[PDB]
Structures are given as C-alpha cells and as structure tokens.
Design a protein around this ligand. Sequence first.
Ligand SMILES: [Cl-]
Ligand SMILES: [Cl-]
Ligand SMILES: [Cl-]
Ligand SMILES: [Cl-]
Ligand SMILES: [Cl-]
Ligand SMILES: [Cl-]
Ligand SMILES: [Cl-]
Ligand SMILES: [Cl-]
Ligand SMILES: [Cl-]
Ligand SMILES: [Cl-]
Ligand SMILES: [Cl-]
Ligand SMILES: [Cl-]
Ligand SMILES: [Cl-]
Lengths: 447, 447, 447, 49
Amino acid sequence: NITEEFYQSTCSAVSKGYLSALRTGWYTSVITIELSNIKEIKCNGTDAKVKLIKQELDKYKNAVTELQLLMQSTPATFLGFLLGVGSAIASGVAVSKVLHLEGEVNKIKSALLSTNKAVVSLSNGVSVLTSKVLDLKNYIDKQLLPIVNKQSCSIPNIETVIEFQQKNNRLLEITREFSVNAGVTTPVSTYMLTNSELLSLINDMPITNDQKKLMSNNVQIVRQQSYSIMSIIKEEVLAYVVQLPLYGVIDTPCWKLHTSPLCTTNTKEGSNICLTRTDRGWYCDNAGSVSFFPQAETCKVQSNRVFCDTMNSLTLPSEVNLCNVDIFNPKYDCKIMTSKTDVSSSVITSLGAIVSCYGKTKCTASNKNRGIIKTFSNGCDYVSNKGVDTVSVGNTLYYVNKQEGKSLYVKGEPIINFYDPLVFPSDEFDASISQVNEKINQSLAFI
Amino acid sequence: NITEEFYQSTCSAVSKGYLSALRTGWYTSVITIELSNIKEIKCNGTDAKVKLIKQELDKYKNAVTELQLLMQSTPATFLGFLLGVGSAIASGVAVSKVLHLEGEVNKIKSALLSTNKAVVSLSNGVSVLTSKVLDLKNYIDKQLLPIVNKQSCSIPNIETVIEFQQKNNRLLEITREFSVNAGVTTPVSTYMLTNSELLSLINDMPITNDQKKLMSNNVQIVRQQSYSIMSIIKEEVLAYVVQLPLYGVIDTPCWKLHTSPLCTTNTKEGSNICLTRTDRGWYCDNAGSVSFFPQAETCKVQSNRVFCDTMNSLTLPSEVNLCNVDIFNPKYDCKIMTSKTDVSSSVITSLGAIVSCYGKTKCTASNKNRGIIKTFSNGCDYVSNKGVDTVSVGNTLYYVNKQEGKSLYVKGEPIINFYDPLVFPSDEFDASISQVNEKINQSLAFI
Amino acid sequence: NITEEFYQSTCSAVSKGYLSALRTGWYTSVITIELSNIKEIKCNGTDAKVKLIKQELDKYKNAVTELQLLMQSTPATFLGFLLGVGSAIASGVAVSKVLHLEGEVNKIKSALLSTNKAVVSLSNGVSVLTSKVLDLKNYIDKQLLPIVNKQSCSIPNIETVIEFQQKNNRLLEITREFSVNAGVTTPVSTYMLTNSELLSLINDMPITNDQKKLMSNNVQIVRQQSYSIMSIIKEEVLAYVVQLPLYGVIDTPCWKLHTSPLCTTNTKEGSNICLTRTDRGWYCDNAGSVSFFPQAETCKVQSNRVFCDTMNSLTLPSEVNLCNVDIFNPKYDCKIMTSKTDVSSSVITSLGAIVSCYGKTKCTASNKNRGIIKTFSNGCDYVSNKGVDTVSVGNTLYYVNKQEGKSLYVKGEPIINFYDPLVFPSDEFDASISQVNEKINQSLAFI
Amino acid sequence: KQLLPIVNKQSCSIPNIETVIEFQQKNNRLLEITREFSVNAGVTTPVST
Ligand SMILES: [Cl-]
Ligand SMILES: [Cl-]
Ligand SMILES: [Cl-]
Ligand SMILES: [Cl-]
Ligand SMILES: [Cl-]
Ligand SMILES: [Cl-]
Ligand SMILES: [Cl-]
Ligand SMILES: [Cl-]
Ligand SMILES: [Cl-]
Ligand SMILES: [Cl-]
Ligand SMILES: [Cl-]
Ligand SMILES: [Cl-]
Ligand SMILES: [Cl-]
C-alpha cells in the first residue's frame, strides 16, 4: 500500500510502499531472419499476378540492399548533473562485433538448422540465446521459385500473392525502423520481436523465476528498456542483437521524494529568502546502500512497482533518508539550494499536492462537485488527494493523482525562519545544510 | 501583424502581435471498439483463402491477448527549473480507473447500442462523450462466422479476405502503438482517432464555438497536446480514454522575449564581465496576470497563434513586462544572470537576429544574392530579417526567419557599462538587478 | 586509428583519431506527388471489387483533405546553456513560402512533365532540385477512371484492387506522418524519400564528390539530420520540401573530451573540495578555430567519423586544446566548476573508463572471464578497455566500449591538492582557473 | 507442364483460377469425342468438329 508523509518544516513529501525493479545489467540475444539469395527475376510475363510478385520481390531486394548499407556502419547512441556517463549499448555492440568475425554466422546458421531457437557459444566465449523468427528463404524457395527461375513463369494463385506480401511485410518494417534510427532502435517493437516471441525468449532465458514472472507481467516496460541493434546480413542470414534488461534488484523498498521551494513570507517584496531540498527523486534500498535517481522521470511506475535504470543513479549511504525526518541530523549533510526567487508553484505527489504559494498568487484546492474547498495562504503547504480533484496555483490548474492511500501531515516550523536574511547565502545551486552554515559563519566572522 | 523591438541596452528583443491558445484543462473521452469473442477456429480446410482468414484471426486474437496484458497495468508517464511538477494524465487515468468498476462497461455498451456516439454518465458523476469507432464484432459475426463455426468451412470469396485484413489492421496498429508506449500515447494518431472522428468529437464537445473553430483549424496541434490511454478490454469491448486539451484562454496578447549575453569588450582577455536577462520565453496576457513559459520550445506557433500549456508556466505580475523598456524600473525586479564567459553566439528571433560578438569572432549578416552586407563589431547588436537571409557567428551559419513584419531598433547604452568589474558578482545563475546591487554594496561595505 | 589519453592531474581524458562531418548549411529540395482530381464516385454497384476500390478512393480523398488542412498552417519546431538559438527549418520554410505564390506550382508542374527529376528556378531566384516520386494522377486516370466515371461500372480485376492499395499506401503514410508531427518530420522516412530516391537526389545534387560519397555511405545519418516540410497541395500536385544537411567541413581532426569530478580524499566527511573541468564534449578543427560541441550527445559517431551540427557549437580559439596537457597554461583560461559534492561516478570513454571514487563507494573494474581485476582507491583514476569488460561504481554497472585502440595514462598530481580548502570557492558552476584564482585572492585580501 | 506440380506432391502447389478454367477447356474435347464414340459404338458419321 502506498502511503505519504508531508514535512511542513522543509516543504517536501515522501511517498512510500513501492517495490523495486532496477535494471542492473544486460542480456544479449541474437535474432535471425533466414533470407533467400535472389539475383535476376526471370520472366517476360506481363501477367498481373506475376507483376505483383515481382514488385514484392523488388521491395524484398531493396530491403536487403538497404540493410547491407546499415551493417557497414558501427551503431551508436535537480541533481542529474552529478550522474556519471555510461555507454548504453556497449554490451550489445560487443556481441554485434563478434557476429562480423569469420564463420561466426555459420555457427548460428547450423545451430538453427533443426530448431528455431538455440543457445550458441560465440568465439569469444559468451553464450547467447539465438532465435529464428522468420524464414523467407524457405517461403521464397518453396512457393516463389517456380514462378521466377524460369522464363515461362508458372502463374501463382492470388492467395500466394497476398500471403507473400504478408510475410515480407515484417522484413520491410524492420528495415524501416533501422533506417530512421541508424541501426539502433528503442523501444523494441513487435516487428523486431512479437509479444509471443519475447515472452518465449524470456521463458528460455537463464534467469530466476521471479525475474521471468516480473518480465512477463511487464513486457511493455521490458520493451522500453530494450535495444535492437542491426548487426549483419550475409550468407542468407539477417541477424540483429536484442539487448534486454537484467533486473538484479527486485522487491526492495522504494520511495519518492518530492520537494518544493520554501520561502519567507514578508510583505516587503525582495526581502524574502528561499530554500529548496535538492535531493528529490526516486530512492530504492539496494545492497546495503540507497540507489538515488535524481531525475524521477527516468523511472516508470506500474501500480506499486518502480522500474528504474541504475545507470541514472547515484549510490548513497542509507543515512540520506534521515533528511526527511530531520534535515539538521548529524549523520548526513542534507542537500539544499538557496535563492530569493519566491515564485509560486505546486508539486503533484503520489497521494496529494505540495503548494508553494508566495506573493499575490491565488492558490486553491478544489473538488469536482463543489469547487474551492481550501484556499492556501502564503508559505508552503500540502493537501491530500482524498476529496480533492484539482489544485490551482495562479493560472495553472493541476489534476491530482486519484491513487488510493493514506497521507500524513507532519507539522513543523518552516526551517527558513531560522535564518537571518542579512547573511543568508542566496546563490547556492548545489549546497547543503552544513555548507550554508559555514558560509554564514564566514560572513559573520567578517563582521 | 508581428512586430519586433530590439533593446540595445540589455541585448534582448521582444516579438509582439501573437494571439494565445493556452491549454488550461483537459477533456476526457472514451473511445470504443466492439470486439468479437472468438475461441477455437473450427476447420480442417487447407484452402488458401480459409488459411488467410485464419491467419488474420490469429493476429486478431494475439492483439486482444496483448491488450489484455496492458490493461492489467496502471498507465503512467533559463528558468525552467522554477516550474512546478504536474501529473499530465491524472485526469485521463482517473476516468480509466472508473471503467474498471463493475457494470461500468455495461453502461457504455448499452448506450452505444443504437448509435456510435453518445454521452454517458459514469458512476462517479462525470459525463463523458463516448464513441464507437469500429465494430469488429459485427463484421466477424456476419461475414466470418459461417466460414469457421463449422468443421466444413464455407470458403469465403477473395474480396472478403482482403476486406477483413483492412478492417483488422486498425486494431493491430492501435495495439502496436500501445505496446511500445506502455499504454499511453502522445500525440494521438489517426489510428486512435481519424481526422474525421476527431473533428466530429470536437463538434460534439460541450465547448464554445470559438474553441470548436480553434480546435478544428488546428487539429494537428490538438493531436500533439492529446493523450490516448489504454483502459479496458472486457465483455467484447475495447475502451481507451482520449484526453483532449481544453483551451480556456484564447486570443489574448502574447509576446516572445529573446535574450543574449551582454559583455564588456575590453581587449584584456579575462577582464570582461557579462550579464544576461534570464526571463526569456513566451509571455501571454492571462486573467489579469501574465503566463510565463521559460522554455519557449514548449509552445507551438501556427502563423500568429501561440499554443502553450499552462503546466509549463509561471504566473507573474504584468509588471514583468516593464523589464523590456526599463530594466531598472522600481515596480518589478528584473531577472538576470552574470558571468565572465564572453563567448560569441546569435539568437534568431521572430523577425531578425541578435548577435553577441566578442573576442576574435567573425560575425556577419548576409543576403543570398550579395554575400556579406554587415560586419558586426564586438558587443551585442541586432539585424532585421528584411534584406537578410543568413547570419554567421564564428563557424556557425544561422538562417533567419523570413516572416514578414517590422522591426524597431531601440538605441541605448549597454547596461553592462554601468558596473565596476572589481566588485561585479559574476557567479549568479538566478539573480536580478536588485540582488546584484545589494551584493555589490556588501562588497563595497567590506571596503 | 582511435587513441586516448587520460590526465590524472585533472580527471579527464581525450579520445583522438576521429574525422569530422559537420553540418554547416542546408540544401532544400521539392518533392512532388502528382494527384488526381476526384469528385463524386459514380456507381450503384454493390460488387465487392468495386466496393474495395471505392473504399481505397475514400482513403485517398480523406488523405488529400487532411493534407489540405495542414498546408493552411505555417510549419514550425555542462556548457550547453552557452549556445545560441537557431531556427532549424527557416531555410526550408522560406522555400515552402515561395511555393504558395501564384503560378509557382505551375513552374514545377510543367518542368516535371517530361521527366520525374528536374532543376527549377523559383521566382525569388533560388534553384531547387525537384522530383516527382509518385504519379497517382496517371494511375487513377488510366486504371480507375473507367470503373467510376460511369454509373454502370466496368468491374476491375482483383489484381488492380491490390495494386491500387499498394500505390495509395505511400500517400496515406506520408499523410500519417505529417498529421502527428504538424507538417514537419525528422528524421526523413523512406515514405518521404526511399533509399533509392535519396541516393539519386544526393547524386544529382550540386555538391563535391567527397560530399556525395560521404552522404551516400551514411544515408541513415543524412536522414536523421534532415527535415520534411509539408508545403502545398493544389492543382493536382502535392509538394513538400525536404531539407538536407550540407557538410561544409569534412575530414578535419576531431577529439572527444571526457571529464569527471576531482575531489580531495580526506576522511573528514564534509572537509573535501571538488573541481570538474566543464569543457567536455566534442571538438573538431574548423577553419582556423575549433568547433566545440558541449552536448556530446548531439554528435553521432560512425566508426571514426563524427557527425555534428554547427548550430550546437561554440567557435573557440584552438588554444582551448592546451587545457588538456596544461590546465594552468597562460594562453587559454581553462574552464572548471567547483563544489564540495564528492559523490562517486564513472565516465565511460571511447577506449576506457574514468572512475571518480570517493567516500565509502566500492569501485572496481572486471573482466567477463575472471571478475574483479582492479579495485580503485579514493580519488580519480582510469582503466583502459583492454582486458576490461565492465566497471562498477557503487550499485551501478557500466559496460565499457570494446572498440580497438591504444590508451595512454599520463601520470600527474591531482590539481585539487594545490588549493587551500579554507578559501576555496566551492559554489562555481561556470568558472575557470583564473576566476577561481582571483576569487581566492579576494578572500585572502579580506584576511 | 501445368498440372504435374499441383499433384505429384502431397503438399500441392495451388493452381491459379485461370489454369482451372483452361484445363476444363482443353479436356472438354476429349470428353466430347468420348461422348460421341460412346453412343455410336466407336463409329461416328458425320464427322463432327
Ligand atoms: Cl515517477
Ligand atoms: Cl493536469
Ligand atoms: Cl487506486
Ligand atoms: Cl554570502
Ligand atoms: Cl517558439
Ligand atoms: Cl539554420
Ligand atoms: Cl510571412
Ligand atoms: Cl562578489
Ligand atoms: Cl558521442
Ligand atoms: Cl551499460
Ligand atoms: Cl573495433
Ligand atoms: Cl568564496
Ligand atoms: Cl487465382
């Protein structure tokens, strides 16, 4: 169950009750389409059905030529600025490089001779699940060869014409996608891997039962965190690498920290000072530490499960959580920014709304059946989503999340009142409680 | 008519003459597709036309299964950093939640029994326009039932095979979109809602005539500001919620503020100081105040109409406009940032170009038929788009907008000259005229 | 060959050996589809093949009506914040404006009467390559006119029904794309311009042989840097402007600068100070200066060729490169930011990994066949990709690029040790070596 | 040359509709000749077309 606490003292709110699903590594799979080698198409037939087959075959050939151009290129793609820099498809591309080595394709080819799904050991030693999802070589050779391997074509039935267009379409769409994404696509579409194929791939994957269940019940999220990397087209084989998320952390507690500016509320226009907790984002317990995702928009929430990517995280000591109940705690130096910009806004939380209302701004909360039920005064305040449908701050209407769950309003003195505006450092974008303190003392020592 | 004024004193320019179209709220509509309940497909027929029908029916069934997986998940998605945080589909999702309640679908179902368009009152009390855009239940039951509700299939004509593929295609594409977007799409495609259906929906909407006209003449913009939210598939009904923008503010004056760095131009390399107005973006008059959109890229301009979203705005007193004619005005504390980074660049405006030219940079403006017609000297300067096609600053060529309209060059002393570099605070990212002043005095008091 | 150097003194690394391909200008081409003027469709025939033709014709007519709505709207779309602001399709839109002038379409129309590819001089004087990619007027008039210009329809063969759907599909997809992108698309899809058409357009373009070769071997990148702009649909002609990149700078040296925070490593928690080189990004030699791209994600790397856009660059003196071998050099004031935020992270480079390891973070580098082979101690360090497959910093696993190439570890004293923490200005987001120095002296003078 | 592929193999390659019609046209003459011989005990007069 989702619960939420608002801290009046620091103009912030924490939503608890979420369970983690963190992408920690990558699985790489090789997806293959078996192609037919087609040179000239031998026919003088002006028959309309032969003509449609020949047009479809030209589309097929142009698709192959197009992909051949692509395989000749190396495929590539508050506190967010503190993040490191990864190379998201380095793992997929490494596998893709191996597929260009001599006889490497042959391994794949003979392995998928009897079945359409096999585990192949590549030359470098990595084992990859390999899958043949479409056999155009077989279709073309068994249904289309008679109609154009001979000058006097045996005219195909209308149903064959339609069927070939259906089969070839997937090749055209895959090529279509690779062509406007420079050989790397994300999310992985159902053309790259159908829902059936993906579920089957997940089920045949060397992963825990929890991971299989998690991935199977959230394939749409799996798709969004996956890449499809165009690799090789040679020796009647199209191969692309699909890079799937590995979720090495599952079902640990996660919570979302929401923060909003906290300013003094003097009537004197520019005499006010402001403070904002900068450590907003997603937090998940992880291996004795806390995975912190400063850009909460990089996580996807499904019911009460949070899908995040560790590439977009910092690893913090778990004491970082103490900033929520006691921003002045001695065990962790809580991060804040400062300013004199007392502009009004709202932060819509999981179960309510934080409202930073300053100056002459009209700030209210409304129910759909009654209109305004609360008018906010200046300062930072909060309303739960129970009985509330919208919040308005100035000319901005916000709808609140109608998710069920309890909110707790933790009363406390706004900590901004504890500071003397004459020595308050109001130009900090990346500071903390202690940095502001020692800076204040350096101003007082000068006095 | 669009007009534009350049203020030499502050290295900024305002483009006037625009009319507002601000998204202020949301309308939620329920779009339905009537589905056929198909279990086993009874036929031993190896007939090629029966085979194509059976393949199309499998695609249909897999689509339904796919969407069933999706409906089991809760759908979710300079001065920009001052903005609040909304929940963009909270309204749509709230309606989507109601559709999961018992007998709620039945209301929709019986309401659309006689017509394909109706207004339904949901259990919570909200009235939503409901629309049936495709009846696959009817097609399958009346055209396809005989061919597979019996072991000995009555073989369908070739035209039926083609027609079914045409009809079923929309279901497949809708599913396709939802599958790579985790059940929430934006913009709303013509698969979700055809141009005809959307116009019809707009026309049947409970909105003013001005709003209907505005939305109808700009449906492509409406699409981009809309969401489609996958909701339920049960009891032979596919339902998704389409969340349409409500434009509560129309035809008020808007203007675009462009700003560029203003630096001193001493020959001594690092002895220069810089100032940039930070309040660039779109401004629209709105309800006695001004809606300010700091990220001008969040607004879409169509001719002289500006489409913005209030979620990406601050609400400011109208005195903010005074900063354009008098940055030192006593009624509003104009926002600026400071630095010593005198790098060269250009800002292409609505009707010209601002050029910040410093150091050894070559800065020119050219006509296509003649080449260089103006060479800029160091400092901040401006050229109108009349007679000018391009501007070059260093190795960067900019094309100017060829929109028709008059520009006015307001001469004035660059305000950066009024500051003493020895006490100039050059580390402010979020300051103002008054903050820089009082900071300067605190440095002078120490002296 | 790609090589790489790590500077221990400044926690940064430069990857060399790349060749430039910088977009410097734009080429504008007019792409045309010849349309048929179809009013009423005259038939009482309930024949299933006539019915499918009539359904396809309605789709055709709705497409035309849809595009007519679109042509009635004016189409529009660390150190990154230092960049100027361009108008990316100003050139394309200017050409698009000309196409709305009287008789301008007629010029295009008669020019493409004998061939499907011609160079037309527009009224304003600009010469544009013009291309007819699809003739629906001819198909409809020669194949479909008999079946519905007469009440008693001559029933078309099944192959014609299929063929028309194939031909019309491209019109529907083009319209589809324009409809969800407000008349401006990027990348340019194969529906807008097939691979064959694009290559042909490139080959007929008034550009050097090097440019043709470069564009032809990298069409997928060309597509991504191109725009398609919906222009006019009148007098049986659909015309859209395709805006292609001109690469005015080719095969000049480029290098990628990677930077990571450098902090002191005292055991006393908040007693540490940090420094980060802010000038990371791509650098290319360009016309006697250096084109600097602060957002390295705006450049696309294909093997050892870097595709960048000068619109996202600053033009710097070539002395900026001196910051790599000597950050205290007297010829260029090297840019840095400061803080006390000693958080751990890694930067994956072209040929290795920079590791900023501070506090209690576990930082290691591993091989796939052996596990941990290096454990990092606190400070900033580096490992080459030779023999290394992954790096871990806290809970974040990074795969390293497996690109071949030599790395050089340049030993040096971390420059952060040269600063006294008691007077170290740790609040600079946009400073430099000299700015930090003079600021330190102003603190010492107060002492 | 036209009918062998469709039935010398268990999995028939399905013939186009035009072939079906054409074969009926060609075979018809054989059927009519047989028809005539069958009601005339192998001797016909006049000799038909
Ligand atoms: Cl979130
Ligand atoms: Cl909202
Ligand atoms: Cl709920
Ligand atoms: Cl201070
Ligand atoms: Cl804009
Ligand atoms: Cl440009
Ligand atoms: Cl104009
Ligand atoms: Cl100062
Ligand atoms: Cl890069
Ligand atoms: Cl990675
Ligand atoms: Cl390599
Ligand atoms: Cl200081
Ligand atoms: Cl047939």
